[PDB]
Write a protein that binds this ligand. Sequence first.
Ligand SMILES: Nc1ncnc2c1ncn2[C@@H]1O[C@H](COP(=O)(O)OP(=O)(O)OP(=O)(O)O)[C@@H](O)[C@H]1O
Ligand SMILES: Nc1ncnc2c1ncn2[C@@H]1O[C@H](COP(=O)(O)OP(=O)(O)O)[C@@H](O)[C@H]1O
Ligand SMILES: [Mg+2]
Lengths: 463, 463
Amino acid sequence: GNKLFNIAQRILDTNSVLLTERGDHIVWINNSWKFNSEEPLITKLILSIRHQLPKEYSSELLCPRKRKTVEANIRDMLVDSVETDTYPDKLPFKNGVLDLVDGMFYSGDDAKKYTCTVSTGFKFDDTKFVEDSPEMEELMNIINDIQPLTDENKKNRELYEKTLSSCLCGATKGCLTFFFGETATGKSTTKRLLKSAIGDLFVETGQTILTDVLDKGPNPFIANMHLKRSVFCSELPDFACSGSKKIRSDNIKKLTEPCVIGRPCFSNKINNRNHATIIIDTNYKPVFDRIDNALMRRIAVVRFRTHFSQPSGREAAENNDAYDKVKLLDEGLDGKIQNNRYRFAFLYLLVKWYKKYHIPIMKLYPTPEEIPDFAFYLKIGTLLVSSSVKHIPLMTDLSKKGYILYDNVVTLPLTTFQQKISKYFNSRLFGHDIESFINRHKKFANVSDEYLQYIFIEDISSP
Amino acid sequence: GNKLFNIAQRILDTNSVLLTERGDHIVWINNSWKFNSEEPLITKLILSIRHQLPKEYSSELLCPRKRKTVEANIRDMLVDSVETDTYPDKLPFKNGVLDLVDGMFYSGDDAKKYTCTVSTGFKFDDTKFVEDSPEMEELMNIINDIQPLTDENKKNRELYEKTLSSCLCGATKGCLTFFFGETATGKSTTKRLLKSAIGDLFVETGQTILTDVLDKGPNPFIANMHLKRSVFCSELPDFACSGSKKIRSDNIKKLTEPCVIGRPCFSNKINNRNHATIIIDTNYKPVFDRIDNALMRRIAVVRFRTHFSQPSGREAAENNDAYDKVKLLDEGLDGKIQNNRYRFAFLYLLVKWYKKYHIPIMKLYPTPEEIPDFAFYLKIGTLLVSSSVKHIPLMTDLSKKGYILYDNVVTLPLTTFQQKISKYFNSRLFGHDIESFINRHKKFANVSDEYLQYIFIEDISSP
DNA sequence: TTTTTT
Ligand SMILES: Nc1ncnc2c1ncn2[C@@H]1O[C@H](COP(=O)(O)OP(=O)(O)OP(=O)(O)O)[C@@H](O)[C@H]1O
Ligand SMILES: Nc1ncnc2c1ncn2[C@@H]1O[C@H](COP(=O)(O)OP(=O)(O)O)[C@@H](O)[C@H]1O
Ligand SMILES: [Mg+2]
């Protein structure tokens, strides 16, 4: 047969070009998988791999028309599709893949077996990926300044390290984290360090993903989150001001699912794979429209309690309760960070933290006791018990306290209930929470019959 | 071998075509990097560089089809991308790049190593970039008329020199500048001089960005801010009249970050690079919806106090208190400025000021003292200290001062608090400000117990 | 209004 078909067959035999389910062709060039929806990178591969072919086939690949013919043959012979990005414990670079389990770096065919379509965007360097380096001690000093290693801050520092370490994993995560602190506290420095550590796997979007409907019309903000591993949203408005849009809880529930529904402009694709940890940098406590048990299990908070002040205003910052330590700031730090001085030391520290927590299994846990707005419900869980058959026999005491056995179940009137809950809740500050909770569980037998099926745990105890 | 392939390889070896992360190709023609989507700049480059090749190669480049073949080979050879605009201390021109560190001018290949996409839009002239010039004395007279060299105007003068100089640097800035002055004081003269000095690096933008959300829908104003170095906001509406929109503080926070989130029309792009200094010219005191420590750290102000009046109204202007000096009004000055008469003389002054200030490090500092609104918040922080363990052991004396014990913490009743803070603030003007401060830190002990968690320094320090 | 569409 003709030599062009033989060249196409030999190229296909190396498995350097593949077709995905989304309809795009990926090519293995320069030790990386690359694709482009508007430029057919196939011809680049044809020109690049001309050296591996024998001598009599190299000369005919210098003409663009024969390259077009070979690309047409390859497109004809390529029929079926394959799946991509199935290994959550591999970190891809521009010249290889790093294994997070043991720490070796793989290049060439060894890295080809893990079909990763995303990368940091820069080459990995072994010389700078060391522990004993002049930059490392300085980075450790900076980090110990931001998060001191004290017995009081141990628990917060653990969440800090775990949340930062989770950015290397390519799996769905069921919790999003808030970075809370005052001004000049080090939150943006941490953001820029993470950006300079992970490169193109990092992205930041607007706040419209938390207050607006996601699936109405085109929405590039949701679409750009596909296959990313870290998403930052920062500088939320103060909700105390009038006209502020409160955070939608259903958006929070949707953002923790493995697939997110959204559509970019001029597109028909509506599914996006969610691999990104979500970090919200803020200065004020969040406010939600509706609070329920489903929302409280997807929220975590990390505190920042160190101030970096000019010498002129130091004496003022020492009189504030929002700070636990005041230190002079360095003016040249931001320029050093912008030049990627601490890229590989921070990456090495992130991998070292990855071994500590996520090797058995990757999991994030909520911290519902850090939000004041969640206080009302939490202690409600420790004060009331739903009515049951076991409470019927002891009615002798409950009728003494004012309970009524109505339809063979122990019951308490709303009017009888409200003062009883008023003795343990400050009616002035929790005025709205009490009327909120009473109305979603009222039970009315008749126009004049009112009752609620709950029993206090203190009354159930034997006196 | 293929002759056209050899021509393409030799062309590529000169590093005249580059591929960016944006998917665009940039070429080096006429001592400048140019790029655009629908133009065949590559073929222009092949035709232009024809003379650098041996004579057996120059003849073939006269046929358009062979040029298309060479372009195809070149496009197939370019696989990797490169960074652009990484030097903040360079001033790109149409025919070269000027280094601000030493002052001498590069051209040719020397200017190629700085991949600067933007340019001033005009041609540099060596002869006109001279100090001893008869235009220089006129420019110096105008500048000294706007900002006199008096002792009481020393510090302000320095600020006036710094901000303009910051227009040369290509880095990010974290402060906002207000050009506050009454009518006919020289603000637009400085704006026009700066525009004539820098060319297309200048941009003028309306007040929509200050008062409206930037992440909702498309926003063309953010799109063209990319890689600009000077942004002016002119004709700020008066806020005393009803219906005026208050300035958003979150917009101020978002305008000082290295990356600004915004989307141009008909596009999916969401990221931009912020390299511009923003100057707002107004005739009235600005007002902000919310005032916090974060906002008063990103604001600077410089004053204009010299008035230009026609001789008819001099009697009206010489007695006004808002002015300091009155001068003759020159009608022909407007004629000279838009003729680009002082294009290079002002540039020399800008470079001199850049050597005076920004050689060690580029930094802009805020001036929160000169704002009528911020003084209320500034003063309170210097008379109140939050209670802690240190102020506990003085338990006895503070009881005689009206302070009340609660939860083993010193507290001050609100009723005891209003008279004492009214000793420094009269309620007729700062009543709303006082109440706005109160609501933030208001804490409740009982249904009728009103108190604050602060202690006065004057009430604890011995007289 | 703007993606839409050309
Ligand atoms: N370890 C450190 N030592 C000295 N200075 C530091 C250190 N870490 C950070 N800084 C500096 O302190 C300042 C803190 O600014 P940064 O933007 O990080 O704070 P922030 O709390 O995130 O601010 P904001 O929320 O208001 O944007 C910066 O100038 C930063 O360079
Ligand atoms: N040094 C000067 N000597 C004389 N006239 C001046 C001088 N500087 C500015 N002017 C006059 O001021 C006018 C422009 O003022 P402008 O910058 O618009 O003030 P404002 O910005 O306060 O409105 C010009 O018509 C010019 O004639
Ligand atoms: Mg910050």
